[PDB]
Amino acid sequence: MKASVQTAATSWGTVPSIRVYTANNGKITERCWDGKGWYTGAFNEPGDNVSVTSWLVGSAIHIRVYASTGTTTTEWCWDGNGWTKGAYTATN
Amino acid sequence: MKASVQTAATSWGTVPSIRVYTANNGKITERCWDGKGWYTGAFNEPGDNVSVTSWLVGSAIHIRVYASTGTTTTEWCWDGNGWTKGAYTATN
Amino acid sequence: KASVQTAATSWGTVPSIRVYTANNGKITERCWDGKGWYTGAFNEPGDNVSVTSWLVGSAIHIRVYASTGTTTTEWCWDGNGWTKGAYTATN
Ligand SMILES: O=S(=O)(O)c1cc2c(O)c(c1)Cc1cc(S(=O)(=O)O)cc(c1O)Cc1cc(S(=O)(=O)O)cc(c1O)Cc1cc(S(=O)(=O)O)cc(c1O)C2
Ligand SMILES: O=S(=O)(O)c1cc2c(O)c(c1)Cc1cc(S(=O)(=O)O)cc(c1O)Cc1cc(S(=O)(=O)O)cc(c1O)Cc1cc(S(=O)(=O)O)cc(c1O)C2
Ligand SMILES: OC[C@@]1(O)OC[C@@H](O)[C@@H](O)[C@@H]1O
Ligand SMILES: OC[C@@]1(O)OC[C@@H](O)[C@@H](O)[C@@H]1O
Ligand SMILES: OC[C@@]1(O)OC[C@@H](O)[C@@H](O)[C@@H]1O
Ligand SMILES: OC[C@@]1(O)OC[C@@H](O)[C@@H](O)[C@@H]1O
Ligand SMILES: OC[C@@]1(O)OC[C@@H](O)[C@@H](O)[C@@H]1O
Ligand SMILES: OC[C@@]1(O)OC[C@@H](O)[C@@H](O)[C@@H]1O
């Protein structure tokens, strides 16, 4: 037997904002916290595995989510215009 | 399930402090580095999968560990005085 | 089939990003510093991977936790190649 779900998390600021990504049944979904209750975020993309990182540029948050199915990893980018596909490629 | 290690890691400051969480045999445990050697930490909760994030408020560390068993993810919170279950829920 | 597993870290405001992929028992690394993705020097065995990093001034320090079976090896970047770290556990 093995685990059936897999998560990744990032956070920023002192409130804080938290984003938790869960890969389950080939789909990644997003839960969000910014100090007043958990809610479902806009991120919804295919994937059996997820990782995430984020950084601030001044006050603006930038998020990168790496979603993998099979040997294909797709990078998704939050830069202030919704989620967009990133340039990331890998030869797996 | 059969013995098998999966980890998550976070760090803070410049020393740094590092915390590494290991899921194995249905339990998540914690190893700690504060600049002078590895030692075992207080975190010990059920789980087959783990992710983590942390943030500083001044010099106080806050840690959130997302422990998953089956399709249920439980958030565990360190805010300076023991690990407590957080409000996180998801619908997996 | 078999799905790869990744871990990611980033630093600064450009930013720099490092993405580690565990694929068929080996962990490799892809890198971004603002001018395209390229393959990094990290190459170690592992079924599972996590990562963290911190800045000391402008200098990045990266720790990659690579696990096979019940054994986790820490790999350390401190400016001059990857070295095995002191991390141990009794899994
Ligand atoms: O040393 S190895 O990791 O190569 C190994 C492989 C297999 C093995 O059967 C064993 C070791 C022996 C063994 C060890 C353990 S442990 O003490 O937990 O390490 C447990 C078992 C076992 O046979 C029993 C066992 C439990 C389960 S579960 O509880 O349902 O998860 C599944 C299995 C078990 O054998 C099936 C199994 C899985 C796996 S896999 O590593 O998950 O692919 C390898 C082997 C297996 O027989 C095939
Ligand atoms: O395009 S699909 O991904 O849908 C596809 C599905 C199946 C397929 O048979 C193929 C493609 C053809 C095919 C492609 C490739 S590839 O060029 O590398 O992408 C490889 C294979 C293949 O049949 C060979 C193959 C490899 C493996 S593995 O080495 O263990 O990963 C498993 C299988 C293979 O056929 C079995 C298999 C699994 C599955 S699963 O449902 O995804 O588990 C679907 C199909 C399969 O043939 C059924
Ligand atoms: O405030 C919620 C939100 O906009 O935060 C940034 C990203 O996590 C988005 O997916 C998410 O919907
Ligand atoms: O989203 C914009 C972008 O340039 O940000 C830095 C890296 O994440 C790149 O892969 C990505 O295309
Ligand atoms: O000093 C060690 C410790 O208190 O650090 C904060 C948390 O990681 C705790 O679980 C851990 O025991
Ligand atoms: O103080 C604990 C808590 O409020 O911290 C912020 C979030 O992690 C919440 O889910 C959690 O319950
Ligand atoms: O500039 C690329 C590089 O040196 O960056 C630091 C580490 O990620 C190394 O593995 C990598 O080769
Ligand atoms: O300089 C390497 C080292 O001391 O860095 C801090 C920790 O990652 C240790 O396990 C590691 O050996």
Measured distance CA(C21)–CA(C25) in Å, rounded: 10
Q: Find where tokens 């500083």 sit.
A: B56
Distance B8 CA to ligand 8 centre (A): 16
Measured distance CA(C19)–CA(A75) in Å, rounded: 10
Distances in Å between the Cα of A59 and the Cα atoms of A54, A82, B36, C12 are: 12, 17, 34, 13
Q: Are B28 and B67 in contact (CB under 8 A)?
A: yes
Retrieve residue C83's tokens: 């070295």
Q: Which residues pair with B54 in a beta bridge?
A: B63
| Structure-solving method | X-ray
Q: Is A26 left (phi over 0), alpha (psi -120 to 50) or beta?
A: left
Give the number of whichever ligand sits closest to the CA of residue B55: 6
Q: Find where tokens 């992710």 sit.
A: B51
- CA-based diameter of chain A, in Å? 45
For residue A79, the number of C-alpha atoms closer than 13 Å in the C-beta half-sphere is: 9
Which one-letter amino acid corresponds to residue A64?
R
Measured distance CA(A53)–CA(A7) in Å, rounded: 13
Nearest CB to A1: which of B1, B73, B75?
Answer: B1
Q: What's the fold here for domain C5-84?
A: Lipocalin (2.40.128)
Closest residue by Cα to residue A43 from A27, A57, A25, A60:
A27
Contacts of B25 (CB under 8 A, 6+ apart): B1, B3
Sign of the C-alpha dihedral computed for residues A54, B85, B71 and B50 taken in this order: positive
| Bridge-based pairing state of the strands C16-23 and C26-32 | antiparallel
Q: Does A29 touch chain C (CB under 8 A)?
A: no
Q: Find where tokens 């079924």 sit.
A: C47
Measured distance CA(A16)–CA(B31) in Å, rounded: 24
Closest residue by Cα to residue B6 from C72, C86, A37, C55:
C72
| Interchain CB distance below 8 Å, C19 and A52 | no
> Which helix H or strand E contains C31, and what residues bound it?
strand C26-32
CA C76 to chain centre: 8
Measured distance CA(C7)–CA(A64) in Å, rounded: 11
Measured distance CA(A81)–CA(C46) in Å, rounded: 36
Q: Where are the domains of chain B?
A: 6-85
Instruction: Determine the distance in angstroms separating the CA of A29 from the nearest CA of chain C, rounded to an integer.
Output: 17
Q: Are C20 and C31 in contact (CB under 8 A)?
A: no
Residue C90 CB: number of other CB atoms within 10 A? 7
Q: Is C31 left (phi over 0), alpha (psi -120 to 50) or beta?
A: beta
Residue B62 CB: number of other CB atoms within 10 A? 17
Q: Find where tokens 């001018």 sit.
A: C35
Q: To one decimal place, what's the resolution in Å?
A: 1.1
Q: Does A73 touch chain B (CB under 8 A)?
A: no
Residue C80 CB: number of other CB atoms within 10 A? 6
Chain B residue numbers touching C45 (CB-CB < 8 A): none
Q: Class assignment of domain B6-85? A: mainly beta
Q: Ligand 6, residues B53, B77, B84: which to mutate, most atoms within 8 A of Cβ?
A: B77
- Cis peptide before A46, with omega less than 30 degrees from 0? no
